[PDB]
């Protein structure tokens, strides 16, 4: 299928409580594989998935030196953002960054990304052409002008079209057994009587990977969207996900309700029903 | 490196 590598940085100032904290996390699709925390006793890039643990000391050293340099850059960016927004040094602020590449089934680059936020809102993003930027406010336009003059999009493009893709392609091979093998959901329908004439029909989906899934209830083949209590997809804690869709049905016609499970791990979409 | 080596600030 299609794949992606993403790195996520969070830089948070905390005046009076020490240096701003910098946290970086790396993912291949929905699997976290690396972490860096500037608050650790000995900050270092460390493995978070089994298939990256094998990497040699040159890998861990290189990522660690880069993450320490990025931690200090985002401490300086936090100070710059205060001047751009005319904010005082007393408040706590956050910069967030998301970047990486998307590849097709052939391993070829489909799209590069490099987006930033300041205090939970878009700040600046690299456009799909990887040669121009979108600034979201007048402070980000100062960064846009600076980055356009310093040729930053060309530097990002060279990384996104090269090493971002090359490393993603290596991780997908090294970890092909978990990364390239979709785990279909283990599904079941529970029944819980809520009243004398009504019952709740919960359509569960467990241990599926990747996280993208679609659960839909149907009353005699008709898609019921307003009567569905749909929960956000949540992690099981073992690199698999869970999701449920519950409906309130009249006690008697429970079997006229069919759950339609849509997932990459299933050859054909599944159809479920409560089996007493 | 697998991560981006940044070359500028904001």
């Amino acid at each position, epitope marked *: 299928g299609s794949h992606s590598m993403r790195y996520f940085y969070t830089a948070m100032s905390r005046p009076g409580r020490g240096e701003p904290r910098f946290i970086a996390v790396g993912y291949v699709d929905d699997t976290q594989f690396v972490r860096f925390d500037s608050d650790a006793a000995s900050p270092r890039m460390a493995p978070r998935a089994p298939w990256i643990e094998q990497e040699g000391p040159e890998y861990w050293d290189g990522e660690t*030196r*880069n993450m*320490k*340099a*990025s931690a*200090q*850059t985002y401490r*300086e960016n936090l100070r710059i953002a205060l001047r751009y927004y005319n904010q005082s040094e007393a408040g706590s602020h956050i910069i967030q960054v998301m970047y990486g590449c998307d590849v097709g089934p052939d391993g070829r680059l489909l799209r590069g990304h490099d987006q930033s936020a300041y205090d939970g809102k878009d700040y600046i993003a690299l456009n799909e052409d990887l040669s121009s930027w979108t600034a979201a406010d007048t402070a980000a336009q100062i960064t846009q002008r600076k*980055w356009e003059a*310093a*040729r*930053v*999009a*060309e*530097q*990002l493009r*060279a*990384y996104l079209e*090269g*090493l971002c893709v090359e490393w993603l392609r290596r991780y997908l091979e090294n970890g092909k057994e978990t990364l390239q093998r979709a785990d279909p959901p283990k599904t079941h329908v529970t029944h819980h009587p809520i009243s004398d004439h009504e019952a709740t029909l919960r359509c569960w989906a467990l241990g599926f990977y990747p996280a993208e899934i679609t659960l839909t209830w149907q009353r005699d083949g008709e898609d019921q969207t307003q009567d569905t209590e749909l929960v956000e997809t949540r992690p099981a804690g073992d690199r698999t996900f869970q999701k449920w869709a519950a409906v309130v049905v009249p006690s008697g016609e429970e079997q006229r309700y069919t759950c339609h499970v849509q997932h990459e791990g299933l050859p054909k979409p599944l159809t479920l029903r409560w089996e007493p | *490196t697998s991560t*981006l*080596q*940044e*070359q*500028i*600030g904001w």
Partner: T-cell receptor
Amino acid sequence: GVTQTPRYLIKTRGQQVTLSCSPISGHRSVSWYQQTPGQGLQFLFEYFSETQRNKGNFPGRFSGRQFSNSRSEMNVSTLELGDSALYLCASSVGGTEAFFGQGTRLTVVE
Amino acid sequence: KQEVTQIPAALSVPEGENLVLNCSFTDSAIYNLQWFRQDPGKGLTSLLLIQSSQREQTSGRLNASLDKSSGRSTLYIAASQPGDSATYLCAVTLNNNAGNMLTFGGGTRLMVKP
């Protein structure tokens, strides 16, 4: 342009030197190189945001630093006669090419 | 792992003749290629920067070509002059590295005799 100081230095065997590099205003990364007639231009280390982000193959007595204003220094401990060389720094920013200073010509004497 | 080679390492050319200087590099995933000249008792003088294999950078009588796939670059000097005499260095920077991080070739000492 990039400015390096001192332009020329004479030091004695066993002592220490500290060389300075002021990159072009606004440049954030600085790399240091040693050029000897017999080994060509050899990379020492790259500094970005006060951090030694990349390092070459010189021993621990070849060290460096970079300040918040991007100015960088390099230091050589226990100077050997073989350490006599032109020490070059180069700066860059974003997607630019390298801009080099005029070097420090160091001669370690008996 | 990146290795940059300049062969021949020395060239002695009569003035007026066109000349070519060669550069090869083992890792094709480069961002920049720079040609420099170095005069005795001096540092580096940037001559040309090239980044695209389809484009060709020129600076007067100096012209440079690049072929990333083959790992090759050429610096052309039309109608050489004695003032062109110097050591010519080619250097390459990888993608996702600062432009100031170069792997240098060994250089070609060019002597253009009057």
